Amino acid sequence: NPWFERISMLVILLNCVTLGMFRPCEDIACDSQRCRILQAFDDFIFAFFAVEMVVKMVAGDTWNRLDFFIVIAGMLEYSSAVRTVRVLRPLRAINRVPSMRILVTLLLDTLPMLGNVLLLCFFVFFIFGIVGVQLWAGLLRNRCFLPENFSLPLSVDLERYYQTENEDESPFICSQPRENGMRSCRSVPTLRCVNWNQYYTNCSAGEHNPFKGAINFDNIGYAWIAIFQVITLEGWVDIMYFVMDAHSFYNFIYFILLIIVGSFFMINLCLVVIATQFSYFGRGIMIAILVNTLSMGIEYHEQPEELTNALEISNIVFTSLFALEMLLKLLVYGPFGYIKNPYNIFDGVIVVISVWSVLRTFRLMRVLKLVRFLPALQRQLVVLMKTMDNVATFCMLLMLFIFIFSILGMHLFGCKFALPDRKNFDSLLWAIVTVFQILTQEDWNKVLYNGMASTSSWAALYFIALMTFGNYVLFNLLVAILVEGFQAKMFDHVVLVIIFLNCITIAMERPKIDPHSAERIFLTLSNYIFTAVFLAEMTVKVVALGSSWNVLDGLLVLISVIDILVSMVSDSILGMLRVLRLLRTLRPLRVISRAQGLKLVVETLMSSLKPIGNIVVICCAFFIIFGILGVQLFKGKFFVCQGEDTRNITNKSDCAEASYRWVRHKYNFDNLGQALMSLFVLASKDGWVDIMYDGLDAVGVDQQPIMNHNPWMLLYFISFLLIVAFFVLNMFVGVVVENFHDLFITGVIGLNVVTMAMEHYQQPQILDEALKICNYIFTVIFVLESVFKNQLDLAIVLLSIMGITLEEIEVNASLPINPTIIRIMRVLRIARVLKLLKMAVGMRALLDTVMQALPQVGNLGLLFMLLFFIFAALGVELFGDLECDETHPCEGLGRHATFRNFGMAFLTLFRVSTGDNWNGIMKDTLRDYNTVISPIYFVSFVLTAQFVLVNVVIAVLMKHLEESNKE
Ligand SMILES: CC(C)CCC[C@@H](C)[C@H]1CC[C@H]2[C@@H]3CC=C4C[C@@H](OC(=O)CCC(=O)O)CC[C@]4(C)[C@H]3CC[C@]12C
Ligand SMILES: CC(C)CCC[C@@H](C)[C@H]1CC[C@H]2[C@@H]3CC=C4C[C@@H](OC(=O)CCC(=O)O)CC[C@]4(C)[C@H]3CC[C@]12C
Ligand SMILES: *[C@@H]1O[C@H](CO)[C@@H](O)[C@H](O)[C@H]1NC(C)=O
């Protein structure tokens, strides 16, 4: 019936409210009358569904089966694992709503097309999963340990190793003597009496891993947690810094390789496979409305009374300048004819609100009336609005997914965590925020370590399944939108070898250079020579030829010439020279002009940029509106005072009595200039949570922040992320859519793969025997394949039969070789896994497609490297003297990431590019004339790195996409 449809959707949605209120802390029932009422509600719903199923047992087939399955579980449940099962109850609804029968059907129909991509992932997880366990097995456990003969006195109460101030986040991991770790022993700080830190010489294994028990490399189970965290690019750096302490500094290659293979090449390959499968008077008012809005953006905490008053007066004059047009438009036009054109209705509503807090805030709707004068924006907005219908279903589908997972997360770890941590799963409202948080991947791993250490280490499957299937229904969204769009002489070379030699001097520069040594003397008179050569080169092109690229080349030579004529005048200022040095780091840009392949790509990006250029203005407009709106809400609010106590304190007048310092948060909403930076850490999606917390804690202009003072401010930040993400998605879509217009042997190998995963840390003697004994078997069978007779297989066996020989020689043959030679050889048995590459015909076809499009990518890749060269060089100049001793604490920069070289400033620029804690880096370049420069350097780098990385993905998409079309 049409009315049989609503009896079901009444009791399915009645079910959710009985799941919505869980109150997990209050376990074992009988808490209140309401709890009993909720229990009573359950019986009615369960009784009704069984009866409904029976009516249908009197009479989508797949969907019908699912309803029966949930019902059977419910009956069994009535007869704590069973209790969590209830959550599935909400899934009955997918069949009920038609708009979801279809979407889900498509989702479920795409999985057999991701057969190949999934297969590729296993190779990546397995290959890097074993190389981790071969190398860093139980390496993380070690700590400085006493020399174990002498026991310290009872009175001192020291632990027995070196504990840091926070042993859960940053333990002190010493490096074994047989290894070369960065953090060697005896580097421990003097104790704050006798200093016991001077007696921590021995370094040996300890019971606990670095983050709770979670970050660890001593099973194949615990390696795949850490590989999954590197691939999701969240907190990946923390892992690499522990490896570099325990086992050398050359371990960075493993991580970089993992990231440009697992994290970029593979995660953005299941976007490619999933989408290739489908295939005069009015001109005066425009000046008036702009200067009204710009009149709003001049707030700024602590403005003088002469300015607040002027602004108030200004508002009054403007209102009459809009009212008397309304009066004019109500007299030169008729009253009925005024209403009919629909923008004239809206422009009169703003007048009535103006004449008559919320009203004060509302003034920001006055920019809206400007779209009556822009034809292009008017057309653009409608197109954007058209996509909402397609988007609404997925969002509706997404809501069910968050609800289910926020309900499930209450059952597993509801009241286990930690006062409790802010990201906790108890109260529902803070469970849906935590599940929305993991879907933006921002500190999803800080919740993992509370999750794994509270229930069990098998609780990573809750977070693997929330991140995977949350990101799988978000890749579909891009594709669904995307599909709809588809249905509507030698001179150049010779001078190039002078620039690449020019780069080496730029790279060489660092602040720790003596003014009189030979590194200094070489850099001064290589400046003279290069400038002269370039200067000579410039005339040749102008006495012969008598253009955009040339001016850039021309400007650079002039700047260099000017630099010498202030460097000569050094005796006779400093400020001009500093500006020149930064400008002098733009020398690398010359390379683009010389290379034709590279040159075309740079021009091409600009042309590609134009179609979505218009949308950017709309996106830009939103930042200003939320920038002004944001400023009004928290002008004096982000003043948090730091001390050791931070209790019994409410005011600046109280926090000065105890002598605690007052800290204005680095990211605050004081000006429109600061609010526009703090809305870039929100938009970036990194560190948005840590901004959001003090936006919820914000109380008053001179007050101390109260935790969770106003949880209604979640609407200011969560709603901002869902329209930044929406706008960014549209821009990506716009750019793409305009371009268009045996069987024994394999089994034997499989058996071998399982055996290599058997190894762990402190495996017993017999499994060390059996594993070794087993190897002697698989060595024989692969020779028996080369008897029975591809080039790689011959090479593969050679490594094997070589390995058995080396290991054996050491025990009873002769003097051993160095252990390092043996260890490398053991790893090289992983090459046997590559042979099953041949069996997978499908993976190779999918894989080659990337190669065909590789040449376009190569130019982009070259461009990406050039951009790190300019920024890295630039970075060293600005941030050379930042340091991190005990007197200067630093948040993002540290021992492993500094800007004091060109090498260390090249690794530091890589984790800004992946997006891991770059706001902690920008937070402490500010901590010491740097307030304007430092946000320009970190905002313009991120928007130009991510924009090159987008143009790679859409270039791999196009070549791959074209294959499907020919058929
Ligand atoms: C995003 C682009 C397209 C436009 C960016 C415009 C901003 C750079 C403008 C808008 C109004 C300006 C602000 C107007 C009021 C002042 C208060 C002023 O207060 C003080 O610091 C006084 C003491 C001192 O300056 O030393 C600081 C600069 C500031 C925030 C200005 C900073 C630059 C602002 C934010
Ligand atoms: C709209 C697109 C480009 C997304 C990114 C926009 C912003 C992230 C960009 C646009 C121009 C940038 C701003 C250019 C001028 C400066 C002024 C500067 O103002 C001050 O710090 C004055 C000192 C004080 O306020 O105390 C703060 C950074 C800021 C706002 C920059 C912050 C980052 C901005 C806002
Ligand atoms: C071991 O103990 C002896 C005394 O039995 C002591 O002389 C020696 O210093 C100790 N060694 C270490 C490394 O602590």
Ligand SMILES: *[C@@H]1O[C@H](CO)[C@@H](O)[C@H](O)[C@H]1NC(C)=O
């Ligand atoms: C260091 O401590 C470990 C564990 O207590 C022990 O095995 C080792 O022999 C100690 N080394 C020295 C030199 O005492």
Ligand SMILES: *[C@@H]1O[C@H](CO)[C@@H](O)[C@H](O)[C@H]1NC(C)=O
């Ligand atoms: C804070 O005040 C409470 C009473 O309001 C008191 O019990 C507590 O000792 C105070 N805390 C400190 C740091 O003294």
Ligand SMILES: *[C@@H]1O[C@H](CO)[C@@H](O)[C@H](O)[C@H]1NC(C)=O
């Ligand atoms: C802050 O000072 C104390 C805080 O304990 C209190 O008297 C008052 O509420 C606040 N304002 C003052 C006193 O200036």
Ligand SMILES: *[C@@H]1O[C@H](CO)[C@@H](O)[C@H](O)[C@H]1NC(C)=O
């Ligand atoms: C290796 O040889 C030595 C002497 O040649 C002998 O003592 C030892 O037992 C041999 N190893 C094994 C495992 O038999």
Ligand SMILES: [Ca+2]
């Ligand atoms: Ca991230």
Ligand SMILES: [Ca+2]
């Ligand atoms: Ca992060």
